[PDB]
Design a binder for this molecule. Structure first.
Ligand code: TA1
Ligand code: TA1
Ligand code: GTP
Ligand code: GDP
Ligand code: GDP
Ligand code: MG
Lengths: 426, 430, 426
């Protein structure tokens, strides 16, 4: 019944993934041992969406864990929930990607993908009706960017009609840890624009802006960033895991969210987010969830939506709430902000409403933006790429893996073609 | 039930015996005076008298007094029956013909009388364990006189034979090639399984694995005895897959004359390294296929394997052994013959290897003795018959053998019979 | 009342036998002393099938123990249940078989068989109505292969109408301990095809595959292999020891299982088998017992049944279960797998159902396959035999016992005749 297969690539993809599995195990009431310990029948009704039943009523999550180094598998397996995953589903190399896309895609991960893909088959053949693939990765570095997009290509060729749905942490100039980040991302975005049905563009600069300007955390870690990402991952699948007044499958999102085939680079958000010391003073209700959700400080990519227009927004609400009040606020937003929505679509907002809010809050909303403002994320990567590439800097590490200079020229060409298609509807 | 008569001949056989009986006494918990403080596990090697004294099923024979008079005076003087330590007056002089025709001709009917008085104390005697030098005058000539008698007197009984054989370069005598070639009729006609061993191969094992830079013969004999403890362990102890002394031969010997296996032991190891190596069943199995651990200086990769007996002892499980021999079958450098698709006979015994307390060889949870019929051993024969050919082309020492009652034609008749054995081991590889 | 006489030959036959006597003594509630200590009247009702009553209500098992060496008698007599057997029924030589069939059949066991057979008479004359002989042995080595088939020949000539039923551990290439294994087996199979009414072909390679790929044991011993064999030995006689909804005697198996006289080389299996750490997650029920029982990994011979077709299968179930559910699953299997059953038999499955499941499980099934895939077990022995025999290797050890080279030629001739009769119905 609409099973999902989930795949984790590199350090970032395994870290946002290993936090996601702690979040949806809390929702479904699954113990770190894999045993069920929840309150409610609704937690158990759709446990098959993310888990396999095994003997003694132990639940085994349908993750595949992929890396070119053992050290992230060792960090996940030893972690808060590490014992939950199937030992056979940890698929790994020994020598890493070197932060090189071409090691991921052509050498170190091209060896390993035959050992990954045949595990993706064992999980997809155990499904009753697979709806799709949910892949967590980063576009900087070499494992997530280059092996993860190799793996997207292989699963896309094998499962052409299932939803391919990716959560993609990607570079920005003011929060960076790699010299060759622009190269790896430009080579990787070239695969995402052709193969994925949805890609949720996420940024460490925007995830730090939520931690300082909303949550007021003094020292936000990667563990705090991974918690913001995984809340929106739990959010968008909610309507195949729980009952609701308006149900929306990942495909019911895609049909409404993607006007023209390639414009599927979304930008997620979440509400309510409150400063930890301030919760007692806030009224949780649909118009406050709306005034947070649609504000430029809440979105998890550096793009200010005031630099573009939305094509479509989806607001996937959770909790006991009025359909008049939801339909009123999703009208009031796009009429009072009409200069920020495209005027050749007569209603830009999809709504969905689940009856079951996250554990410990009365309501919640996961936001998905599609906006021409995502041109700014692809533009700044393309101009960092260009300034290195005009002087061929660092290319011997990629051409040493047998990659052509022509593949860089063709990747940055396809990047400007993606920038041009969003700028066309501005 | 399950007795063995051990016959120790000449200096090499007696000195290997003085290591064999040093080991068997420790392994069965018998004091060097033959008493036992506190199951019939000892019964293969020791007769028990009503005083509670365990007396070894051994005969020690030398044509000169010196080495056995040392056994009659050292710590084991009270172990042996005084008339089964047998000596003559006159050395065999590294001359086969003194051992066989002239000097050993006098002691033989006394040697047989002791072997008769030992066999009459057995009940289902399993076989004979005969220890000797191929290069000696007593080693070659007296063993070949004795075996001819035992092969008419005890024709059914299995005769296992442990031979110190001449090396590629290391030698102690000028006439070592003559005595060895004259012995080849003994092993072909009057033996059932003949374990050739080489001093130079054990000297290299000692250097590389025990890290002893300069070993004596006490270091060699403590390895040669350890193999016979492991061949006999299934006769003496409980195991998962115990191997009978004829069950061993039915898997080792493909053809009546093809009964010259190599032998090797693993792990040979010192206390410096035994605490850092894993010594898993996979490693000690693979160690037996290294040229580095073969106790004859020939390369198994220049041959084909006909059959292997992997005789494990100590803490091992048939899971681990099958998983190990599966990797040996996978390796293309270890080549079996086309006609032996099974290849491996496995034995597994629950008794660990006993340490001699004075020794170099360390305490370990596991050992394997691999006994292995392979075409490669024909090179150790091709070395020595090329040493023989240079000397017989001159008749270089032949007057000492002709002078002591040998026919001169026996040298040609022995080089001929060796060429027919070296033919047989080349013929079956195909 | 349908007594069985049981006979153990060589090391393997006495080891699978001495474990079998621990299993059926647990079932019948008999103490290692031979005293009855069970719960239930049903344990005592048919105790005569495998035991003799003796003074003080001590029960003495109707085993004959045969070896050419004392050391396995010493290992059995000193063992967990060794004191149970009659001292007169340990019949043994002193010098072993040397792993030689011709020592077993012509020399060492030809001396001893006069002392064995006259004990088989004392047990068979103590029976009220003997149904058959249940002989445990191995086809490798020399005692079980050569003395056990001498003893089959002698008991067959003396008792021509009683069931002769043998459990036969036999060679395979990847799990071998003997050089001359192919010779001994080929000389022995030549006796089994003519004399036995049933032979249950068992393999150490398949018994190790159950231990690693099903039970997940890290270090399986021969004691663990002997436990898998003896579960199926207890299984096939269950219907003359306990009540049931469908009773099947060993003869009611043979009439249904053996279409043409010589095609009686069966291939056993058992269910449920579960990884020791996983039992609480498994539902014990007839369709899970079926999906284990009919799968190629569960059978105790190396033959994958997907390399042939079944002639007949017998499924001897035990436990409180529905006849509709049993008859439904034994239909669903042979209709959904119809390419793996012969289509000139209109129903290939025999069923039986006992009311008493093994101590500590709610249900169990013993599987007996007859399949043309058993050609592969006889073929690989015949080709190992051929590659040695073309160069006469090792034959002086057999011809030394006065055996002809013509007997090897005639044994391998009769082996290819058995291969051809299974391949004929493919
Ligand atoms: C008494 C009270 O009001 O407790 C709240 C709380 O104080 C606040 C501040 C919580 C708290 O959130 C954080 O501290 C936080 C820190 C870094 C990054 C993200 C969150 C809270 O920890 C988080 C926690 O939320 C959950 O448990 C959700 O179900 C969430 N899952 C987890 O956070 C989680 C934690 C550990 C293990 C497994 C899951 C979730 C979100 C989306 C989809 C599914 C589940 C809640 C209600 C609270 C606390 C406990 C203080 C907030 O988070 C959520 C998701 O509600 C942060 O802003 C909101 C507003 C809440 O009022
Ligand atoms: C609490 C619980 O579930 O205990 C089980 C158990 O955990 C499992 C894993 C058992 C266990 O089996 C093994 O450990 C095993 C190991 C190697 C080879 C064969 C078995 C068990 O030991 C075996 C034991 O089975 C029996 O006792 C049967 O009656 C069996 N007889 C014996 O095993 C036996 C043991 C000692 C002395 C005498 C008999 C039998 C089988 C066929 C016909 C007659 C009797 C059982 C139910 C269990 C344990 C105890 C864990 C399993 O075996 C059986 C026969 O049920 C292995 O897969 C099954 C599934 C069971 O769930
Ligand atoms: N390993 C080992 N080899 C020995 C030992 N003693 C002698 N040898 C070998 O014995 C071989 C020569 O045989 P001899 O020692 O002369 O044999 P022998 O029977 O005493 O000969 P005779 O004195 O003529 O009777 C040499 O190659 C030696 O290396 C010993 O204790 N251990
Ligand atoms: N949110 C998040 N970002 C991470 C984490 N670890 C690394 N990153 C960041 O995103 C990039 C991820 O690249 P990485 O996953 O290391 O490359 P890979 O291992 O070769 O795929 C890094 O440069 C970091 O800036 C993590 O746990 N969480
Ligand atoms: N299952 C099982 N197999 C055994 C056992 N002992 C030996 N075997 C195996 O099967 C073969 C049996 O031959 P064996 O019984 O030793 O020959 P015999 O004593 O002359 O009849 C051996 O080569 C082993 O591989 C045992 O206890 N259980
Ligand atoms: Mg001497």
């Amino acid at each position: 019944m609409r099973e999902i297969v989930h795949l984790q690539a590199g350090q970032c993809g395994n870290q946002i993934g290993a936090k996601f599995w702690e979040v949806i195990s809390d929702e479904h009431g699954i113990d770190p041992t894999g045993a069920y310990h929840g309150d409610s029948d609704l937690q158990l009704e759709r446990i098959n969406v993310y888990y396999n039943e095994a003997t003694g009523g132990k639940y085994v999550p349908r993750a595949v864990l992929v890396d070119l180094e053992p050290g992230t598998m060792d960090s996940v397996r030893s972690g808060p929930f590490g014992q939950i995953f199937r030992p056979d589903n940890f698929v790994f190399g020994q020598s890493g990607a070197g932060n090189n896309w071409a090691k991921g895609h052509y050498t170190e991960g091209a060896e390993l993908v035959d050992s990954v893909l045949d595990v993706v088959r064992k999980e997809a053949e155990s499904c009753d009706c697979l709806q799709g693939f949910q892949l967590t990765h980063s576009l900087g570095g070499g494992t997530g960017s280059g092996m993860g997009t190799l793996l997207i290509s292989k699963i896309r060729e094998e499962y052409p009609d299932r939803i391919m749905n990716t959560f993609s942490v990607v570079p920005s100039p003011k929060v960076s840890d790699t010299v060759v980040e622009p190269y790896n991302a430009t080579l990787s975005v070239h695969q995402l624009v052709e193969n994925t049905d949805e890609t949720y563009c996420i940024d460490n600069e925007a995830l730090y802006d939520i931690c300082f300007r909303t949550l007021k955390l003094t020292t936000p870690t990667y563990g705090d960033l991974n918690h913001l990402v995984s809340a929106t991952m739990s959010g968008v699948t909610t309507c195949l895991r729980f009952p609701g007044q308006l149900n929306a499958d990942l495909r019911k999102l895609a049909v409404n969210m993607v006007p023209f085939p390639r414009l599927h680079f979304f930008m997620p958000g979440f509400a309510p987010l409150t400063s930890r010391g301030s919760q007692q003073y806030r009224a949780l209700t649909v118009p406050e969830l709306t005034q947070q959700m649609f504000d430029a400080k809440n979105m998890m990519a550096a793009c200010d939506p005031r630099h573009g227009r939305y094509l479509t927004v989806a607001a996937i609400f959770r909790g006991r709430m009025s359909m008049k009040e939801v339909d009123e606020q999703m009208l009031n937003v796009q009429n009072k902000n009409s200069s920020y929505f495209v005027e050749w679509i007569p209603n830009n907002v999809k709504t969905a409403v689940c009856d079951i809010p996250p554990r410990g809050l009365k309501m919640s909303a996961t936001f998905i933006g599609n906006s021409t403002a995502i041109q700014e994320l692809f533009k700044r990567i393309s101009e960092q790429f260009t300034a290195m590439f005009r002087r061929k800097a660092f290319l011997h590490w990629y051409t040493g893996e047998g990659m052509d200079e022509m593949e860089f020229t063709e990747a940055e060409s396809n990047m400007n073609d993606l920038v041009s298609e969003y700028q066309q509807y501005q | 039930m399950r007795e063995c008569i051990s016959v120790h001949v000449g200096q090499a056989g007696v000195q290997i015996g003085n290591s064999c009986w040093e080991l068997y006494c420790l392994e069965h918990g018998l004091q060097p005076d033959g008493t036992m403080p506190s199951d019939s596990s000892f019964g293969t090697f020791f007769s028990e008298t009503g005083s509670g004294k365990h007396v070894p099923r051994a005969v020690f024979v030398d044509l000169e007094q010196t080495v056995i008079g040392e056994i009659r005076n050292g710590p084991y003087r009270s172990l042996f029956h005084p008339e089964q330590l047998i000596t003559g007056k006159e050395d065999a002089a590294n001359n086969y013909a003194r051992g066989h025709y002239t000097i050993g001709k006098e002691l033989i009917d006394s040697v047989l009388d002791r072997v008769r008085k030992m066999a009459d104390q057995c009940s289902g005697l399993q076989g004979f364990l005969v220890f000797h030098s191929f290069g000696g005058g007593t080693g070659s000539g007296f063993t070949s006189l004795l075996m001819e008698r035992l092969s008419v007197d005890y024709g059914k009984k299995s005769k296992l034979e442990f031979s110190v054989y001449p090396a590629p370069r290391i030698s102690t005598a000028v006439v070592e090639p003559y005595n060895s070639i004259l012995t080849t009729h003994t092993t072909l006609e009057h033996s059932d399984c003949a374990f050739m061993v080489d001093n130079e191969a054990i000297y290299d094992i000692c250097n590389r694995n025990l890290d002893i830079e300069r070993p004596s013969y006490t270091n060699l004999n403590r390895l040669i005895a350890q193999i016979v403890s492991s061949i006999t362990a299934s006769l003496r102890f409980d195991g998962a897959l115990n191997v009978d002394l004829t069950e061993f031969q039915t898997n080792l010997v493909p053809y009546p004359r093809i009964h010259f296996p190599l032998v090797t032991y693993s792990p040979i190891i010192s206390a410096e390294k035994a605490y850092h190596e894993q010594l898993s069943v996979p490693e000690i199995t693979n160690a037996c296929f290294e040229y580095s651990n073969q106790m004859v200086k020939c390369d198994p990769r220049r041959g084909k394997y006909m059959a292997c007996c992997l005789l494990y002892r100590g803490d091992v499980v048939p899971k681990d052994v099958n998983a190990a021999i599966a990797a040996i079958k996978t390796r293309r450098s270890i080549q079996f013959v086309d006609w032996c698709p099974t290849g491996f006979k496995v034995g597994i015994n629950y008794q660990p290897p006993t340490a001699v307390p004075g020794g170099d060889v360390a305490k370990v949870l596991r050992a394997v003795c691999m006994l292995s019929n392979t075409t490669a051993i024909a090179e150790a024969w091709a070395r020595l018959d090329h040493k023989f050919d240079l000397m017989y082309s001159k008749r270089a020492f032949v007057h000492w053998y002709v002078g002591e009652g040998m026919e001169e034609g026996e040298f040609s008749e022995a080089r001929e019979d060796m060429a027919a054995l070296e033919k047989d081991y080349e013929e079956v590889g195909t």
